């Protein structure tokens, strides 16, 4: 029966869309823009407009929240769709605003909300429906309580609208909107899908899996920075799927006087079990269940034991599911990890770049913005923030925008109308001012992401590029060849050469190309850890790396550790021993199933311990040659890609004269030339100012002042202060180590043996 | 590396539990690795874990002296730098029987080659002797 359709989540947010595939259009021979009749649960009736969408399957109907609530149904149910061509243009419509939707407006609903939303829409409406309208910066619901014809009718230009009277009393099963939904979350699509897949089935079908007799999960942990929306996620899931959300807070429990707390806890569970399949969310667990050594008195231990017993004693039976929110999965007591206890754990990573953009779009939805708005730049510059941070920044930007208009917006009072405040076009001045008074929260926090470094960013070292491609991409792309041959790919790769010159650039480029997460470990912070934490810290670092598989781990200046071992002190070597032992133990603990490459950059391979250089550890050593002519030319071109042009010299000529210079030196030379150009522009502007004061308002057009390009004079200025970063003895020692390696693997030519 | 980690702090209980676990699983063959790492850290530019290393080795010696001949559990130690080893280990009752491992050659090389060359893609190969 290709007429009943299973309702699911939708893509179009318009109030009058039911999405059908083109074969479905062919099936019923329906028109586009025609009204169709929808029948569902609670004996509800709806009228809607058919729209085209090839994403939905033939048996799938895509349809938003407003009309889904109009039928008083949720996703996953079955509805009946039929043609309704007998609809005709409406005559009069009397609507009535909801009580808690128009507070603090004092305006003409016709000329701000009714006129634009109802314009050229032709949305069919039936008596009893509720429709939401976006406004200046608020969204307001209206309930159509009378219409001609009744109950179903067509919104037409020849309709008189009456929206005067006492607000209608709130309904009961109307499933009031303005609640959190799946769309209301940005930047966490992967985790959202992961949690949706393994939670929806037991709740939507409490008896189906019971008939299957497969034990569902009972406890899920969510950990991350505070204020990232974990409570928001839980509330949205409860609202969307349909459940009996029951929130309990740890500080509330701690506020009570001992025993009743536990009783309250008991009450909570006996509340949820008797109210059908329900969902329980508990927050700030470490605040009530920290590590047992952190626990000092006996009351907290009693509470912990009580909650453990309560949660274990409800093993399945009732379909209640509980999740918890915390900061990190390393502060709570470890006993809350057993089978049947909290076992499935999820991290909520910091939104970055794109996710920040969707967060802004979600928050910057209602208030009207100026055409100057450039959200992409804001998302680029803003990092180390959370959804709450961006919401606060948007709030303060709106406050600044309104504040500067007191004279125009009648600073006194007189209950400013909606259209007057509508004029507050948000400007980049407001955003910059808000950013001036801005404070991030994450800051000193590890970030896992995919960098955006391209292959053309470097001279190329095409042999090394191909070798790394062979090492990484093919093993995961085509495991069949290895499993047939029985070869296990290596894991630890090391680089050595002049300081810098692409190492980190190579790591970022390969991470970007392979489309895998990147984790960086720095020598300075390594030595910071070196005093104190040396065993646990590596443990959670590698646990985090394992969780983000597939990913690539990078180590910067590993020899710095041996720099403490071999240096001007040579006395704190116990910590270095601890670090090395931890690293080796973890490397031996790395299973072959995990696909995580490890890269290490070392300037001096000789000082470092050769014990690392063994099978099952870092084995592939790649030398870094100095940039040479064409490589230098490409590097200079990449540097010049920023803004100015160098159409006054010969780049390869300069490379010829500047042999033996690292790419870092070339970038520094470019920066010096840029500084000279900036100073030239500044002095040209100063001369313009001087001639302005000598003759007021003489001439103000743009003179031949330095615009973005590097003239030759700047080039001599830059080349004069050119640095030979690497001394010859450094090349001597690099080639000494290379020849040491070659002598071991030394077999002069061949003779085609066994011929 | 695990032993060197156990040098600082958690040493006594680990040794006791590992020897007890070996003892209850009799008969068994306890094995050791990096037996020269203790002496490698004993003499060098670190000079930090020497006290912990000496404590660990003393504990090991005492506990292995503490076993009863009833338990049919054997002990095997391996190293590649035997000179740096403390003579106290090379004592009666302690490790006394010593075996040198000569490098493979020809017959040994061909044997290890033909023992490791299982794989799926054997091709048809050539003479292992000249290899
Ligand atoms: N992806 C997002 N989309 C929309 N709003 C978001 C998002 N992430 C965070 N927010 C906002 O940040 C705030 C987070 O609120 P809330 O305290 O409920 O979150 P939380 O992460 O569960 O908090 P907690 O610190 O208690 O663990 C809210 O104002 C919410 O609107
Ligand atoms: N376009 C480029 N081509 C090649 N090398 C580059 C380019 N841009 C920057 N580099 C190199 O990247 C290096 C970064 O240095 P640094 O991060 O301190 O050491 P490492 O690269 O070993 O991590 C610089 O020394 C510079 O020479």
């Amino acid at each position: 029966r290709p007429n009943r359709l299973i309702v699911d989540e939708a893509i179009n947010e318009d109030n009058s869309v039911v999405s059908l595939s083109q074969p479905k259009m062919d099936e019923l021979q329906l028109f586009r823009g025609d009204t169709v009749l929808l029948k569902g649960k609670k004996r509800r009736e709806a009228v809607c407009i058919v729209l085209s969408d090839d994403t939905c399957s033939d048996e799938k109907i895509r349809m938003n929240r407003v009309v889904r609530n109009n039928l008083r149904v949720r996703l996953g149910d079955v509805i009946s769709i039929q043609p309704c061509p007998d609809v005709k243009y409406g005559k009069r419509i009397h609507v009535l605003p909801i009580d808690d939707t128009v507070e603090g407006i004092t305006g003409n609903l016709f000329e701000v909300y009714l006129k634009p939303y109802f314009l050229e829409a032709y949305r069919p409406i039936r008596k009893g429906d509720i429709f939401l309208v976006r406004g200046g910066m608020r969204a307001v619901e209206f309930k159509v309580v009378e219409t001609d014809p009744s109950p179903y009718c067509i919104v037409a230009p020849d309709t008189v609208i009456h929206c005067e009277g006492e607000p209608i009393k709130r309904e009961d099963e109307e499933e009031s909107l303005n609640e959190v939904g799946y769309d209301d979350i940005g930047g966490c699509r992967k985790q959202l899908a992961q949690i949706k897949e393994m939670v929806e089935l037991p709740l939507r079908h409490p008896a189906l899996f019971k008939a299957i007799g497969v034990k569902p999960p009972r406890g899920i942990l969510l950990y991350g920075p505070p204020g990232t929306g974990k409570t928001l996620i839980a509330r949205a899931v409860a609202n969307e799927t349909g459940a009996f959300f029951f929130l309990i807070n740890g500080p509330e429990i701690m506020s009570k006087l001992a025993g009743e707390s536990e009783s309250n806890l008991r009450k909570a569970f006996e509340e949820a079990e008797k109210n059908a399949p329900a969902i329980i969310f508990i927050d700030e667990l470490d605040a009530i269940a920290p590590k047992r050594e952190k626990t000092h008195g006996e009351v907290e231990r009693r509470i912990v034991s009580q909650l453990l017993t309560l949660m274990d004693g409800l093993k399945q039976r009732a379909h209640v599911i509980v999740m918890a929110a915390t900061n990190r999965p390393n502060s709570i007591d470890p006993a809350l990890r057993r089978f049947g206890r909290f076992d499935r754990e999820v991290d909520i990573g910091i939104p970055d770049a794109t996710g920040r953009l969707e967060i802004l779009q979600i928050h910057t939805k209602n208030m009207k913005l100026a055409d100057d708005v450039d959200l992409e730049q804001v998302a680029n510059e803003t990092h180390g923030h959370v959804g709450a941070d961006l919401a606060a920044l948007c709030s303060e930007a709106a406050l600044q925008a309104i504040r500067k208009k007191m004279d125009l917006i009648d600073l006194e009072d007189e209950t400013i109308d909606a259209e007057v405040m509508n004029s507050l076009a948000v400007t980049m001045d407001d955003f910059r001012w808000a950013l001036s008074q801005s404070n991030p929260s994450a800051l000193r926090e590890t970030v896992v992401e995919v960098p955006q470094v391209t292959w053309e960013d470097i001279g190329g070292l095409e042999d090394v590029k191909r070798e790394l491609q062979e090492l990484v991409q093919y093993p995961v792309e085509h495991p069949d060849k290895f499993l047939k041959f029985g070869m296990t790919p290596s894991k630890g790769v090391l680089f050595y050469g002049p300081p810098g010159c692409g190492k980190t650039l190579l790591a970022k480029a390969i991470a970007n190309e392979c489309q895998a997460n990147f984790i960086s470990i720095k020598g300075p912070e390594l030595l910071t850890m070196w005093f104190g934490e040396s065993e646990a810290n590596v443990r959670e670092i590698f646990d985090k790396a394992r969780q983000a598989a597939p990913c690539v781990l990078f180590f910067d200046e590993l020899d710095s550790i041996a720099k403490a071992r071999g240096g001007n002190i040579g006395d704190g070597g116990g910590a270095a021993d601890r670090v090395i032992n931890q690293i080796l133990t973890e490397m031996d603990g790395m299973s072959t199933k995990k696909n995580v490459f490890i890269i290490g950059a070392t300037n001096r391979p000789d000082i470092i311990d050769p014990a690392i250089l063994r099978p099952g550890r870092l084995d592939q050593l790649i030398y870094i040659p100095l940039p040479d002519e064409k490589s230098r030319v490409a590097i200079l071109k990449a540097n010049l890609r920023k803004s100015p042009v160098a159409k006054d010299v010969d780049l390869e000529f300069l490379a010829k004269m500047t042999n033996g210079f690292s790419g870092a030196d070339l970038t520094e030379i470019c920066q010096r030339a840029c500084k000279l150009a900036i100073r030239e522009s500044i002095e040209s502007e100063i001369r313009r100012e001087r001639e302005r004061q000598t003759n007021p308002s003489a001439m103000e057009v743009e003179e031949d002042d330095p615009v973005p390009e590097i003239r030759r004079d700047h080039f001599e200025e830059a080349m004069r202060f050119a640095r030979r970063s690497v001394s010859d003895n450094d090349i001597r020692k690099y080639e000494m180590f290379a020849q040491t390696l070659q002598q071991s693997r030394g077999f002069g030519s061949f003779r085609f043996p066994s011929g």
Side-chain angles (χ1 to χ4, degrees), chain A:
Chain A
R1 266 266 304 165
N3 295 132
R4 292 180 179 90
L5 287 173
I6 62 170
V7 67
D8 284 325
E9 283 144 308
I11 298 169
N12 199 332
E13 47 270 33
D14 209 345
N15 287 357
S16 63
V17 289
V18 289
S19 302
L20 281 169
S21 299
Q22 55 275 13
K24 293 288 120 172
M25 311 275 188
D26 305 329
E27 175 202 327
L28 299 172
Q29 293 299 297
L30 289 169
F31 293 99
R32 316 199 74 260
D34 47 10
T35 300
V36 289
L37 214 57
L38 299 196
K39 287 171 157 176
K41 195 151 279 313
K42 303 293 291 296
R43 284 316 305 125
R44 297 302 328 283
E45 203 67 36
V47 294
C48 198
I49 299 297
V50 172
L51 277 297
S52 302
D53 179 22
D54 53 351
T55 314
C56 76
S57 299
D58 305 359
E59 79 283 351
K60 298 291 181 68
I61 189 66
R62 315 292 296 277
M63 191 284 258
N64 50 356
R65 195 142 76 81
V66 65
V67 189
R68 206 150 71 236
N69 196 2
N70 284 136
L71 292 177
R72 265 73 169 162
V73 298
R74 293 158 186 279
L75 58 90
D77 206 287
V78 285
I79 65 166
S80 304
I81 181 167
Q82 69 205 85
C84 191
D86 57 347
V87 291
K88 64 90 175 179
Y89 281 29
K91 300 295 187 291
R92 65 177 305 273
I93 299 166
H94 177 75
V95 295
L96 196 60
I98 319 299
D99 47 349
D100 57 351
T101 191
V102 76
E103 267 83 1
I105 298 299
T106 314
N108 193 260
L109 299 174
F110 175 72
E111 61 94 11
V112 292
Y113 292 6
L114 271 286
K115 183 67 180 294
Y117 174 63
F118 280 65
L119 199 49
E120 60 94 24
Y122 292 164
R123 297 183 211 274
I125 61 165
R126 190 192 159 279
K127 177 171 150 150
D129 62 353
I130 50 172
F131 66 99
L132 182 58
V133 180
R134 298 289 176 177
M137 65 182 179
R138 288 179 175 176
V140 171
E141 300 175 355
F142 295 97
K143 180 177 194 295
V144 184
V145 300
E146 178 58 32
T147 184
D148 199 74
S150 192
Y152 77 91
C153 62
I154 303 297
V155 171
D158 60 288
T159 56
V160 193
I161 298 104
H162 290 89
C163 198
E164 288 87 1
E166 180 180 0
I168 186 167
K169 175 63 175 33
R170 267 290 198 182
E171 312 92 336
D172 298 333
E173 75 288 337
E174 90 274 29
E175 319 178 7
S176 172
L177 280 75
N178 298 115
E179 272 195 316
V180 289
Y182 280 122
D183 58 329
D184 293 331
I185 300 168
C188 282
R189 303 285 82 73
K190 320 284 305 306
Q191 311 89 329
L192 172 64
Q194 294 149 27
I195 193 57
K196 279 166 78 129
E197 287 281 351
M198 61 79 71
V199 169
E200 195 271 351
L201 272 176
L203 280 188
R204 198 49 75 77
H205 323 83
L208 194 143
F209 73 99
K210 189 262 298 180
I212 312 299
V214 169
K215 173 62 148 52
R218 289 188 63 214
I220 297 173
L221 277 178
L222 324 172
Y223 62 90
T228 52
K230 300 174 262 267
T231 313
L232 206 65
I233 293 168
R235 195 77 70 75
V237 163
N239 282 353
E240 289 283 350
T241 69
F244 185 57
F245 186 88
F246 193 40
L247 196 143
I248 58 171
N249 203 6
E252 305 168 1
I253 316 299
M254 295 299 102
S255 58
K256 307 307 163 35
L257 189 152
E260 59 258 30
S261 298
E262 290 157 357
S263 169
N264 303 321
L265 297 165
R266 188 137 49 249
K267 181 262 295 178
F269 287 167
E270 62 84 22
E271 160 65 26
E273 61 86 20
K274 76 173 191 299
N275 278 65
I279 195 67
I280 303 185
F281 177 83
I282 178 63
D283 191 4
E284 296 179 351
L285 272 296
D286 57 356
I288 68 170
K291 188 63 65 67
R292 61 107 173 175
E293 62 92 4
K294 316 267 201 287
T295 71
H296 189 73
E298 289 313 295
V299 191
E300 63 273 38
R301 291 172 170 92
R302 290 199 59 188
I303 299 160
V304 166
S305 303
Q306 171 61 79
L307 65 94
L308 286 173
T309 296
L310 263 170
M311 81 76 78
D312 265 345
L314 268 295
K315 192 63 64 188
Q316 207 271 329
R317 278 85 67 191
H319 300 72
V320 62
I321 301 185
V322 192
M323 61 295 298
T326 183
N327 192 1
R328 279 158 295 99
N330 68 341
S331 312
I332 75 166
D333 189 74
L336 279 81
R337 277 148 184 160
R338 309 301 177 274
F339 318 103
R341 286 162 206 183
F342 301 106
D343 43 351
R344 281 76 179 273
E345 309 200 20
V346 180
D347 205 326
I348 318 297
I350 292 165
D352 285 316
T354 309
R356 288 191 284 255
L357 170 59
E358 285 93 9
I359 284 170
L360 294 175
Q361 293 174 1
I362 288 165
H363 282 319
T364 55
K365 167 181 298 182
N366 315 321
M367 71 305 298
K368 183 266 289 181
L369 309 192
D371 49 355
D372 198 16
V373 161
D374 195 67
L375 301 167
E376 288 76 4
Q377 178 49 250
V378 188
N380 290 134
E381 56 196 357
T382 310
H383 50 81
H385 299 235
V386 302
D389 286 348
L390 309 189
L393 188 152
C394 176
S395 171
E396 75 169 348
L399 265 293
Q400 178 49 242
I402 184 171
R403 271 177 275 143
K404 204 161 299 303
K405 289 88 174 177
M406 294 298 102
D407 296 331
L408 275 297
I409 310 176
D410 191 59
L411 73 164
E412 178 266 336
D413 199 50
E414 305 313 314
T415 182
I416 297 89
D417 207 352
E419 66 269 18
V420 183
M421 61 79 71
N422 266 278
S423 315
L424 296 156
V426 177
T427 67
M428 294 298 102
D429 190 10
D430 303 324
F431 270 99
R432 286 186 299 272
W433 179 89
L435 288 159
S436 315
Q437 301 176 357
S438 188
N439 190 4
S441 76
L443 282 173
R444 281 200 265 283
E445 179 60 34
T446 313
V447 58
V448 171
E449 76 279 0
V450 184
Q452 306 314 309
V453 166
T454 77
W455 291 117
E456 48 85 18
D457 296 340
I458 310 307
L461 298 172
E462 308 301 325
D463 45 358
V464 193
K465 166 62 182 295
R466 172 183 58 257
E467 184 44 55
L468 271 184
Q469 201 77 258
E470 295 176 359
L471 286 149
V472 183
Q473 193 53 258
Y474 306 94
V476 292
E477 268 187 348
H478 316 288
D480 44 356
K481 269 83 177 177
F482 291 166
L483 60 91
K484 167 206 181 310
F485 275 50
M487 295 298 102
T488 62
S490 292
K491 211 56 66 174
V493 179
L494 187 137
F495 297 145
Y496 60 99
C501 319
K503 293 183 174 69
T504 181
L505 275 299
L506 270 162
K508 296 173 69 63
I510 188 51
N512 184 20
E513 181 269 345
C514 202
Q515 206 63 261
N517 292 319
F518 182 86
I519 296 180
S520 173
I521 293 302
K522 274 182 269 195
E525 58 95 26
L526 265 170
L527 271 296
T528 307
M529 294 182 286
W530 185 65
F531 296 106
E533 63 280 12
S534 171
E535 294 160 352
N537 201 350
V538 182
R539 283 272 290 102
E540 70 269 14
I541 284 165
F542 284 4
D543 293 320
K544 184 194 295 180
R546 167 201 43 73
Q547 182 182 179
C551 75
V552 176
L553 176 54
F554 173 82
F555 284 114
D556 205 339
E557 191 50 40
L558 209 64
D559 195 22
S560 192
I561 307 165
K563 203 74 67 177
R565 169 192 171 101
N568 49 5
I569 306 303
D571 289 328
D577 164 74
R578 290 200 307 280
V579 160
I580 293 309
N581 295 151
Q582 267 277 331
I583 291 173
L584 296 188
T585 318
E586 300 315 308
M587 295 298 102
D588 293 25
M590 295 298 102
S591 75
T592 176
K593 188 202 173 319
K594 304 290 313 193
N595 314 325
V596 172
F597 266 89
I598 300 151
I599 310 173
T602 56
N603 199 3
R604 308 306 305 179
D606 46 352
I607 295 90
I608 207 64
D609 190 4
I612 307 167
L613 291 87
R614 264 189 286 99
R617 278 90 171 277
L618 274 77
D619 285 323
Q620 292 76 7
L621 316 189
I622 304 190
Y623 173 66
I624 306 305
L626 268 75
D628 43 351
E629 288 83 25
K630 277 71 59 183
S631 172
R632 318 175 195 140
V633 166
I635 293 164
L636 291 184
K637 289 311 204 306
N639 304 141
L640 288 150
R641 294 289 84 72
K642 296 185 289 292
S643 171
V645 309
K647 269 180 44 58
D648 205 9
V649 288
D650 194 42
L651 280 80
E652 50 270 27
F653 193 35
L654 312 165
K656 294 154 206 142
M657 51 204 87
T658 50
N659 293 313
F661 278 6
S662 77
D665 175 80
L666 276 298
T667 59
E668 182 267 354
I669 290 303
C670 174
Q671 167 158 347
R672 293 278 300 109
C674 291
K675 180 61 65 67
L676 276 296
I678 290 295
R679 172 147 32 82
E680 287 218 33
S681 178
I682 292 297
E683 57 86 19
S684 63
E685 178 262 315
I686 289 309
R687 171 68 259 169
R688 296 151 71 260
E689 274 307 314
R690 285 172 276 175
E691 61 86 20
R692 257 185 299 282
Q693 291 100 25
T694 63
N695 189 3
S697 76
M699 171 285 258
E700 303 90 333
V701 72
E702 182 263 337
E703 294 82 0
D704 190 69
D705 46 1
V707 296
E709 71 273 15
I710 314 182
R711 306 159 184 80
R712 201 170 298 164
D713 46 358
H714 316 73
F715 275 124
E716 290 87 5
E717 300 295 325
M719 61 79 71
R720 269 206 323 284
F721 312 93
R723 299 282 165 288
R724 170 55 67 88
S725 64
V726 54
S727 69
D728 316 316
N729 53 4
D730 302 325
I731 297 105
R732 299 172 230 153
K733 301 323 282 195
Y734 289 165
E735 73 195 1
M736 183 278 288
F737 184 55
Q739 293 315 111
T740 305
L741 293 189
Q742 176 68 40
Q743 280 159 349
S744 49
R745 281 88 73 190
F747 195 79
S749 180
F750 281 125
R751 76 278 194 197
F752 193 60
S754 303

